[PDB]
Every structure is written in C-alpha cells, then in structure tokens.
Amino acid sequence: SRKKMGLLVMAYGTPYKEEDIERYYTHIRRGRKPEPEMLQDLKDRYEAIGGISPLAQITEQQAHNLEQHLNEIQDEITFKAYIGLKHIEPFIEDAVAEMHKDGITEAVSIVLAPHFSTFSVQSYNKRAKEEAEKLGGLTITSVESWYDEPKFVTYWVDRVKETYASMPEDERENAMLIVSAHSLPEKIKEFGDPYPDQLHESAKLIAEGAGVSEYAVGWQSEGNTPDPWLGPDVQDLTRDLFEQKGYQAFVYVPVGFVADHLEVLYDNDYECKVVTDDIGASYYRPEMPNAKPEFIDALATVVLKKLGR
Ligand SMILES: [Fe+3]
Ligand SMILES: [Fe+3]
Ligand SMILES: [Fe+3]
Ligand SMILES: [Fe+3]
Ligand SMILES: [Mg+2]
Ligand SMILES: [Mg+2]
Ligand SMILES: [Mg+2]
C-alpha cells in the first residue's frame, strides 16, 4: 500500500580505522598530504578520545534509527536510508548512484548539521541533485536547515537545564553558557550566508528555553586556509569572558555538531577543558544527540514536515 522513498542522509564523514587518517585529511586539505609530524599528532588525538572505530558507527546508527522510526510513525511511505559523505566513501555521488540502481525514483535528503551554509549544506544538496540529474529518473527534495525544529531545540534546552541543576549553588549563579558550531571562512558573508545568524538564533532559543540569561556565541575547529575564519574561537572566547567577568563554570553546547566526533571530544572536551582548568573554572559539556530516540524523533519530524506530512 505504501510509496517507496529514498532517505539520503549526508554528513562530513569520518575515518573507519587509523590507517584512513592520511587519505581522510588529504581530502579535507584539498589534495595536500599532511606531513609526518601532523599524521602522528592526529593519530594521538584519536587515541586520546577513545579511538576511531566508534566514530563512523554513530552516523550509521543515526541513519538506521531514523529509517526505522520514520517507517514506524507513519503509514504512507516506506523509507530506505542511504549514507552520502563529503570526505570518505560512501561519497554523496555513490549514494545517489545506489538509490538509482535500487530503483528509487523519489527521495528526501537531510544533512546531519542543523544550520544552513553555502559551504557545506548547499554544496551537498547541489551535488546530490546534480548526480540525480546526470542519472535521470530520480528526484530529490532537500532539507536546508533544521536548527529551529522545536523538538531539536527542546533536546538541548533539557540537557542544559539538567547541567545547571547539577551545579553547586555558587556555580549555578556564576556560569557562562557557550553555544558553538564549526567555524567557516568569513568570506561566506559575500553571499549573504545565513550560517552565523542561524547559530545566534540556535543560541537564543536554547538559552531562552533553559532560562539561562548569560550566554555567548563562539566558533570552533577552524581549518587552515589563509583567509580569515569566523570567530571568536571558543578557546579565546572562554578566556576573554573569564578575564572580563570571572565565571566559575563554563557549559559548552556545540549545537552545530550532532555526535561524539573529534571536534567535540577533542576540540571541546580537551581544548576547552585545558583553558577552564588553567583559569580554575568547572567544565561542563552535556551529551551530544548521537542516535538517542529524542533526537531521532526530532529528525523524523523535520523530514515529514519537509514532505508536508
Ligand atoms: Fe532498529
Ligand atoms: Fe521509534
Ligand atoms: Fe555574536
Ligand atoms: Fe573540520
Ligand atoms: Mg591497524
Ligand atoms: Mg527553515
Ligand atoms: Mg583545531
């Protein structure tokens, strides 16, 4: 009785094993192989966060759970998930090619990053659509952003509330909430890219929902291209805010990220933690969504809303 649809789930991608680090970072760096010292540093970082293998598993579990939950909560469509990645196989084009091979003619896509940008989301969507056009007989409707889905806001609001509730009384009254996403080159401004505005809006919505009056917006994980990147960086922001007002606790909500990957487990849980430890403040960073039912229901709602269902 049901219509078949592809569910194209897109993400940055992560190495599968240590021996993938070289090719994965070469791809990120646009063909420039990391030097030996950098390769070694990267391996050490992954070791420090508990290893590589669990990383790509999260993305897989998110796609699987999303597929199953979508199929459970409505009776009109049967979805089949395909994963399409930017920096490692299966590439976006591979996923579209497989949908076509499997006889999918209608699909909906979503990127596992809640804010629209020209650099990432728009590029992924365009790439998916271009391959579908090349192959023919398959159309894709694409989710562009989802940071403002109420169920998603509620996820983080509730995690934040729990974190503040857990604090000793003196911290609860002298904390700062830092809401962040992956930095991008400032030059996206030239195109009117709403990415920064959307991060600020995520921050406002989460702080408001949680009843937190003192918060700030920062960026993290900037690449090394010569042109300026969006700032301030969370490490600098933390110290600046401390020097300015003396906060006893910092709560990090990397809302731009959806899982326990290197840019949270290392860029927050290590790099930010260095700074909080140095200044004598308490470090908190509530659970990432990962593949938890609350987050999966949020994504499901996003997809069904995009289809008018
Ligand atoms: Fe299942
Ligand atoms: Fe379910
Ligand atoms: Fe700002
Ligand atoms: Fe990055
Ligand atoms: Mg090995
Ligand atoms: Mg929208
Ligand atoms: Mg970095």
Curated annotation (Swiss-Prot):
Location in the cell reads: Cytoplasm
Pfam families in UniProt: Ferrochelatase
Residues that bind Fe(2+): H182, E263
Q: How does activity depend on pH?
A: Optimum pH is 7.2 with Zn(2+) and protoporphyrin IX as substrates.
Q: In which pathway does it act?
A: Porphyrin-containing compound metabolism; protoheme biosynthesis
The residues the record assigns to binding N-methylmesoporphyrin are Y12, R30, G31, R32, H182, K187
Listed under GO biological process in this entry are: heme biosynthetic process
Q: What does this protein do?
A: Involved in coproporphyrin-dependent heme b biosynthesis. Catalyzes the insertion of ferrous iron into coproporphyrin III to form Fe-coproporphyrin III. It can also insert iron into protoporphyrin IX. Has weaker activity with 2,4 disulfonate, deuteroporphyrin and 2,4 hydroxyethyl. In vitro, can also use Zn(2+) or Cu(2+).
Q: Which SUPFAM superfamilies match?
A: Chelatase
Cellular component annotations (GO), alphabetically ordered: cytoplasm
InterPro entries cross-referenced by the UniProt entry? Ferrochelatase, Ferrochelatase_AS, Ferrochelatase_C, Ferrochelatase_N
What HAMAP family does UniProt report for this protein, alphabetically?
Answer: Ferrochelatase
Q: Name one GO molecular function term.
A: metal ion binding
Organism, per UniProt? Bacillus subtilis (strain 168)
Matching entries from PANTHER family are given as: FERROCHELATASE, FERROCHELATASE, MITOCHONDRIAL
UniProt cross-references to CDD domains, sorted A to Z:
Ferrochelatase_C (cd00419), Ferrochelatase_N (cd03411)
Task: Describe how its activity is regulated.
Answer: Stimulated by Mg(2+). Inhibited by Cd(2+). Inhibited by N-methylmesoporphyrin (N-MeMP) and 2,4-disulfonic acid deuteroporphyrin IX (dSDP).
Q: Keywords in alphabetical order, please.
A: Cytoplasm, Heme biosynthesis, Iron, Lyase, Magnesium, Metal-binding, Porphyrin biosynthesis
Q: What happens when the gene is disrupted?
A: Deletion mutant requires hemin for growth.
Q: What EC class is this? A: lyase
Q: Where does Mg(2+) bind?
A: E19, R45, D267, E271
Assembly and interactions? Monomer. Interacts with frataxin/Fra.
Which reaction does this enzyme catalyse, per its entry? Answer: Fe-coproporphyrin III + 2 H(+) = coproporphyrin III + Fe(2+)
Q: Which PROSITE patterns match?
A: FERROCHELATASE
Name-wise, this protein is Coproporphyrin III ferrochelatase
Describe what happens upon changing H87A: Retains 5% of activity
Q: What is its main location?
A: cytoplasm
